[PDB]
Write a protein that binds this ligand. Structure first.
Ligand SMILES: N[C@@H](CCC(=O)N[C@@H](CS)C(=O)NCC(=O)O)C(=O)O
Ligand SMILES: N[C@@H](CCC(=O)N[C@@H](CS)C(=O)NCC(=O)O)C(=O)O
Lengths: 221, 218
């Protein structure tokens, strides 16, 4: 059997969402690291796989699947032993899709608006409005957490997506525990997963440390 | 019937309008004026804690978020799956495109427009305009076929066109740099319901942003 290949970078939040999902599904990924600093994502071959030139990208026996949310849905749909991680039911699926688009359109987008300029454009200071954009995202997430998980009272791929970015950005933009108790309670649930630290926690800590290090290098230049 | 809590100038609302027209559905549109904070009432927070439009009410079934709404409508009301495939591989291509729209096209549109519309902004910072230019290039490269995914119309087209048609009225989209985007726009514009469901609101929102920008400068 052809083993699954993930074009990936462990410090990348969307890549870690897929790693979490693969662990939950009992899948083993062959990880191929893609160095963005040396433009490994901008080779002709990579751009052929993904014209938007982002990681993660999955190669499943020749079938190329781009984009973390799409990859997770694909993996649950194809390999899941049940639909617990991503419901096939019309209404619950719609709740999950809404949450996944909140992650791409709000959580990750705003994370990137803060981190990208530091990592790729010599940024040495985070503009106040962009930090506040993230604070606003924390509040939106806090209000989304009406139940134990992002959607309902059991773990789903919406949790993997949201935690991958929240765990990263909270190491750069302070997330006040007195303001957002539900986010921290939810993080605690996810941290109890045996695969959480290896699939996500480690890389979330690593990326925040890298962002802060680069920001300081840039400031001290 | 089908109720949409909506604002015609809003790109994600117009994506749903396009989708409903394609499905032959009639929406009862209930306007929510974001400018006067009608989205921040307790009742609206009840339907959607993230306080955004669009929200669909389908005989009491509440569905938030434009992409989720379109998938829901096609799944429940489509005569077939043309607009959103149930097949594993094509569905994944569609999902990737929909998340490109939310995470890149709409996010960057909002990063330009929101400060002007809601925060008294009178400027578009160079870096944010450039962020949109980069989005145009990403879209141009995504268009390897006649539509966003494949060679027939899907909800990924509705999502992407709703935001592209809006932001191009604020951040110039050079036809010499982006010929494929223009070719694709023409395919969407040829739909008999395009102007009513999307084109009009796209023009209105661009005018709104430019007008407010100048008012704020005074
Ligand atoms: N919506 C995408 C976002 C992917 C993304 O932006 N990945 C970043 C790494 S965190 C990347 O590859 N950037 C390279 C580039 O944008 O050129 C997903 O969830 O897969
Ligand atoms: N991903 C959401 C985005 C919705 C969204 O941001 N809508 C804007 C109008 S264009 C809004 O309701 N803003 C009000 C707010 O953020 O409080 C979707 O596609 O439905």
């Amino acid at each position: 059997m052809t083993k699954l290949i993930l074009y990936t970078l462990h410090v990348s939040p969307p890549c870690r969402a897929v790693e979490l999902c693969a662990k939950a599904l009992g899948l083993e990924l062959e990880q191929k690291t893609v160095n963005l600093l040396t433009k490994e994502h901008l080779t002709p071959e990579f751009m052929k796989m993904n014209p938007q030139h982002t990681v993660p990208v999955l190669d499943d026996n020749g079938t190329i699947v781009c984009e973390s949310h799409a990859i997770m849905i694909y993996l649950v749909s194809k390999y899941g032993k049940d639909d617990s991680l991503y419901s096939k039911e019309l209404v619950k699926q719609a709740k999950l899709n809404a949450a996944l688009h909140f992650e791409s359109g709000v959580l990750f987008a705003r994370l990137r608006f803060v981190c990208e300029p530091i990592l790729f454009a010599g940024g040495s200071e985070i503009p106040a409005d962009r930090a506040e954009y993230v604070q606003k995202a924390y509040q939106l997430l806090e209000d989304t957490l009406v139940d134990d998980y992002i959607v309902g009272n059991s773990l789903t791929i919406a949790d993997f997506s949201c935690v991958s970015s929240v765990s990263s950005i909270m190491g750069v933009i302070p997330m006040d525990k007195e303001k957002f108790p539900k986010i921290y309670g939810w993080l605690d649930r996810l941290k109890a997963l045996p695969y959480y630290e290896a699939a996500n926690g480690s890389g979330a800590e690593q990326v925040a440390q890298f962002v802060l290090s680069q920001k300081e290098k840039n400031a001290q230049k």
